[PDB]
């Protein structure tokens, strides 16, 4: 079976730049190669067929090239919307096969997170549980740290973090951190603190409520 391999595994480029994605086939596939673009929370979309044929509708900045065993997708001027996983596949011989994908991200100006904190709902509190939630929204770069404090003391167990994919409009990231405790640990403290560490500030961004 023909094996397809893409490079790079991942990268980030600035809007406007030229980007080059490569795809190697373990044996000759002439020009029977397609490129698919799979944006976050979406189904894949055909960009290029027959190695170099722009699918109807595709913006001109996307040009496919190559033959035999080596193939290239070039984006002449990346746009923030071009954020995505790009896949290449050969349709020369059965079974049809695909590379492992290239994750393209967009570089943008550093951006500080909007931090917002939420106490447990009375609904949850009635069940025995208490989740405290903190949204750190639309920042860049992706690297961020969250720290939870209870009456001044860092809490460690019971926290769950999730990060969104990069946003196609503004190129930022968002994160959610939920601290979960029992009802009767929660009531037994007053001050709840969400503490964000990001390269945009030398001091952490703190958000906090009492009660």
């Amino acid at each position: 079976n023909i094996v397809m391999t893409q490079s790079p595994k991942s990268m980030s480029m600035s809007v406007g730049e030229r980007v080059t994605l490569t795809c190697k086939a373990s044996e000759n596939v002439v020009t029977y190669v397609s490129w698919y673009q799979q944006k976050p929370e979406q189904s894949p979309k055909l960009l290029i067929y027959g190695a170099s044929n722009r699918y109807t509708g595709v913006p001109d900045r996307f040009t496919g090239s190559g033959s035999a065993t080596d193939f290239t997708l070039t984006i002449s001027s990346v746009q923030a919307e071009d954020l995505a996983d790009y896949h290449c596949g050969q349709g020369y011989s059965y079974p049809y096969t695909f590379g492992g994908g290239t994750k393209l991200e967009i570089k943008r100006a550093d951006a500080a997170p909007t931090v917002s904190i939420f106490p447990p709902s009375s609904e949850q509190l009635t069940s025995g549980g208490a989740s405290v939630v903190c949204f750190l929204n639309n920042f860049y770069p992706k690297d961020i740290n969250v720290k939870w404090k209870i009456d001044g003391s860092e809490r460690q167990n019971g926290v769950l973090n999730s990060w969104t994919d990069q946003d196609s409009k503004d190129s930022t990231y968002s994160m959610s951190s939920t601290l979960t405790l029992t009802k009767d640990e929660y009531e037994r403290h007053n001050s709840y603190t969400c503490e964000a560490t990001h390269k945009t500030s030398t001091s952490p961004i703190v958000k906090s409520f009492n009660r």
């Binding site: 397809m4 699918y55 049809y96 695909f98 994908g101 939630v133 999730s162």
Partner: protein, 216 residues
């Protein structure tokens, strides 16, 4: 509109079989081969096989030989893929799609979970700051969708209307149960002088839930 409709989700016991459906409309069903593909997170696509709706003619990936069988129903204009002897290796998103150079189209994909575990509806908790006027010119509201199985859930705000400034975070599995949250950001001119309501569906449990965000 050209459409290839697949069920959102399917939960199935390991060792059992399942019939994935892909229901076609908007074009002449019998004039295009239907391709089935498998997608696991952080993997590339795997091609399962293809079937000609005109006659039922098929081509399979040898790898899926004992695993997948492709059929078609011309009167329902529906393609089906049967998966047998299911194992955890089978849990993945499955897509049907048409691969023509002048006509390339993909279903939404069905999320297959094979698990002995029983289905658990989500708890959904409104996230209010709350109070008022804090802070900047807009407000961030949210919903915590907790303790469910299996994936997926779908979260909308004001039934789709509010698509601006929504962030829905990827579910995380914490102990045989998933949790996710979603936040929305709106000018304080709307809220709370308007309904802001998160809508949550859990296909597997047929759960539908609306939680209005109430101040404080």
């Amino acid at each position: 509109q050209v459409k290839l409709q697949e069920s959102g989700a399917e939960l199935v016991k390991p060792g059992a079989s399942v019939k994935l459906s892909c229901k076609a409309s908007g074009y002449t069903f019998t004039n295009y081969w239907m391709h089935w593909v498998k997608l696991r997170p952080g993997q590339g696509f795997e091609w399962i096989g293809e079937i000609n709706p005109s006659n039922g003619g098929s081509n399979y990936n040898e790898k899926f030989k004992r695993k997948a069988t492709l059929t078609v129903d011309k009167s329902s204009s529906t393609a089906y893929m049967q998966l047998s002897s299911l194992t955890s290796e089978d849990s993945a998103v499955f897509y049907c799609s048409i691969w023509d150079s002048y006509f390339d189209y993909w279903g939404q994909g069905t999320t297959l979970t094979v698990s002995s575990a029983k289905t658990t509806p989500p708890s959904v908790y409104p996230l209010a700051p709350g109070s008022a006027a804090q802070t900047n010119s807009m407000v961030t509201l949210g919903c915590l969708v907790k303790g469910y199985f299996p994936e997926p859930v779908t979260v909308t705000w004001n039934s789709g209307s509010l698509s601006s400034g929504v962030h829905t975070f990827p579910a995380v599995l914490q102990s045989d149960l998933y949790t996710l949250s979603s936040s929305v950001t709106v000018p304080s001119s709307p809220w709370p002088s308007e309904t802001v309501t998160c809508n949550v569906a859990h296909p597997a449990s047929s759960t539908k839930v609306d939680k209005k965000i109430v101040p404080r």
